[PDB]
Design a protein around this ligand. Structure first.
Ligand code: THH
Ligand code: THH
Ligand code: CL
Ligand code: CL
Ligand code: MG
Lengths: 206, 205
């Protein structure tokens, strides 16, 4: 039946990343004072700006490279162990570019989240903003959701709409979506720490 | 259900054994907004593909079959020589050896090839001579994922090419390479941008 993830405040948070680190930056700025989590480590699979931002904020960085393990299954086993060594309560995938495998999700399903710049299940994939623009919707949005076995498929945690303006291009639309995407992620992490989450079918309530 | 994630901007290693014409189409395309870069070329022999790779200042590694004690040993060594460049995609571009189970155990799902016939018709190394001898009126090119030995992995992209009266092997092969070059460059970009999902034998990007 249901999956219950208990409250965890003050939460130990692990961010997984491969890219720019801007969501990472958004989470480091917010996790101060009474914010009910702290970033305890950043995991990357390659040298990247996110690793740099993490080190500059005195956050431990662990690296697990696909090229150092004999296959995808063994990499899944190793990322899982390197992440567990930090005992997180929550894992944010923030620009991470590897699919999290069966072993990782066996351990961290319910506690792992991702953000997407459309109102899932509309516009999944890497071109969510450009697609929403080509499709001619007037309303798009940002989604935070639990990571499951598929990509963009997990139980939804929080959503907020964002208008498409006349004459918007991709860039101007994307930046508008990113403003909301950042707040939504920050609020979702706090809420999961404070209240935990229950999942019935595919529906996630705090 | 095989799922390979997007990798743009992707690190490409191209493996080659011959002319380097497919390779050159990739080198020329893979700049700017193209969602990938060629980071290394691997060859199992001296060939024009390796020379073309040095002209564009791309590192070349060479793993010759004769330099190892067994087909198995060669397979381990080429896999390691490739993994060293941390590729996101491995493109087989006139590469003349079966890629072994060790290579596929690391790279299956991320390895692709262009074949000058419309698979499953005319597989193997003489797909063009075979298509001609059979007397088909429509042949083509197929970009597909590479799998175990002779087997054809999920088809990524295909495009047809007419056989014309009086064609010989050469003119027909030249017509198909024109389509191969475009199709490969388009498929690498799509694979890099979108990744791939496989249901049954069917691949979607
Ligand atoms: C793309 N293709 C290929 C393939 O389909 N599968 C493997 N494992 N490895 C490779 N490597 C290169 C390429 C074709 N090479 C060959 C080599 C020999 C044969 C054959 O004996 N028929 C068929 C294909
Ligand atoms: C979060 N998501 C995910 C998932 O949903 N489920 C599993 N099991 N594992 C994972 N791991 C990470 C991710 C799936 N893979 C990827 C990998 C790469 C991209 C990608 O490069 N996206 C582009 C922008 C497009 C986007 O918003 O996805 C980028 O900003 O980098 C997008 C998704
Ligand atoms: Cl709105
Ligand atoms: Cl035709
Ligand atoms: Mg995303």
């Amino acid at each position: 039946e249901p999956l219950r993830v208990p409250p965890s405040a003050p939460a130990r948070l692990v961010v997984l990343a491969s890219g720019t680190g801007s969501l990472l930056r958004s989470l480091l700025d917010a996790a101060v004072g009474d914010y009910p989590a702290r970033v305890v480590a950043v995991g990357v699979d390659r040298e990247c700006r996110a690793a740099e931002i993490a080190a500059e904020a005195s956050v431990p960085v662990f690296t697990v490279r696909l090229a150092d393990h004999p296959s995808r299954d063994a990499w899944d086993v190793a990322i899982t162990a390197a992440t567990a060594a930090h005992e997180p309560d929550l894992v944010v995938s923030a620009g991470f570019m590897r699919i999290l495998g069966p072993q990782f999700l066996s351990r961290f399903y319910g506690r792992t989240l991702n953000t997407h710049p459309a109102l899932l299940p509309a516009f999944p994939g890497t071109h969510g903003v450009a697609d929403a623009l080509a499709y001619g919707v007037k309303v798009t949005g940002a989604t935070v959701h639990l990571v499951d076995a598929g990509t963009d498929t997990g139980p939804i945690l929080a959503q907020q709409p964002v208008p498409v303006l006349d004459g918007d291009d991709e860039e101007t639309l994307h930046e508008r979506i990113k403003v909301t995407e950042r707040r939504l992620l920050v609020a979702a992490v706090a809420a999961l720490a404070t209240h935990g989450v229950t999942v019935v079918g595919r529906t996630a309530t705090m």
